[PDB]
Amino acid sequence: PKFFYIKSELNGKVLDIGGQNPAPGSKIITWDQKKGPTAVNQLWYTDQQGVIRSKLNDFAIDASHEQIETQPFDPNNPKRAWIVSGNTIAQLSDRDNVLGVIKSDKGASAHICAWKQHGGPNQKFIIESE
Numbered sequence: 001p002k003f004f005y006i007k008s009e010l011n012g013k014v015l016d017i018g019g020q021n022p023a024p025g026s027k028i029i030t031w032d033q034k035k036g037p038t039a040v041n042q043l044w045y046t047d048q049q050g051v052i053r054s055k056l057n058d059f060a061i062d063a064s065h066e067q068i069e070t071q072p073f074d075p076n077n078p079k080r081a082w083i084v085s086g087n088t089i090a091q092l093s094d095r096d097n098v099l100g101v102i103k104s105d106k107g108a109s110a111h112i113c114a115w116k117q118h119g120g121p122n123q124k125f126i127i128e129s130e
Ligand SMILES: CC(=O)N[C@H]1[C@H]([C@H](O)[C@H](O)CO)O[C@@](OC[C@H]2O[C@@H](O[C@H]3[C@H](O)[C@@H](O)[C@H](O)O[C@@H]3CO)[C@H](O)[C@@H](O)[C@H]2O)(C(=O)O)C[C@@H]1O
Pocket: 016, 017, 018, 019, 020, 021, 029, 031, 041, 108, 109
């Protein structure tokens, strides 16, 4: 219902499920903000507890692998509980661990990782209502 974009303060692009792939394990990148029907893979919402889910498949953000990917939500997996805290997307169980944008080294789209808060814009995001 209440959807929003998560925009990076590093490049101005938004969290986006690469190629709108609905399958679990799909990498989340930053891509030009889209508007209209096709923007679904860039739209997110928070469940009751405040955990971020994707409008595309209701999957959560997961940081179990090298780069963040979408995965079905699991209340027992600390790596799948991410919330909006100020201008940071922080881990529910560790506010010091936050998402950050890392530009591609091979001309690809930027990807996202989770690591200790270091105050730069790469770890800052703006929540934009749909
Ligand atoms: C190898 C490759 O295909 N690289 C492209 C990359 C991949 O397709 C995705 O990472 C697969 O998950 O997508 C890039 O663009 C991202 C945007 O894709 C848009 O959809 C594309 C789709 O990805 C293309 O494969 C398809 O041919 O056209 C679709 C529509 O243009 C999404 O709509 C958009 O939100 C982004 O996710 C990328 O940079 O990752 C382009 C790579 O060349």
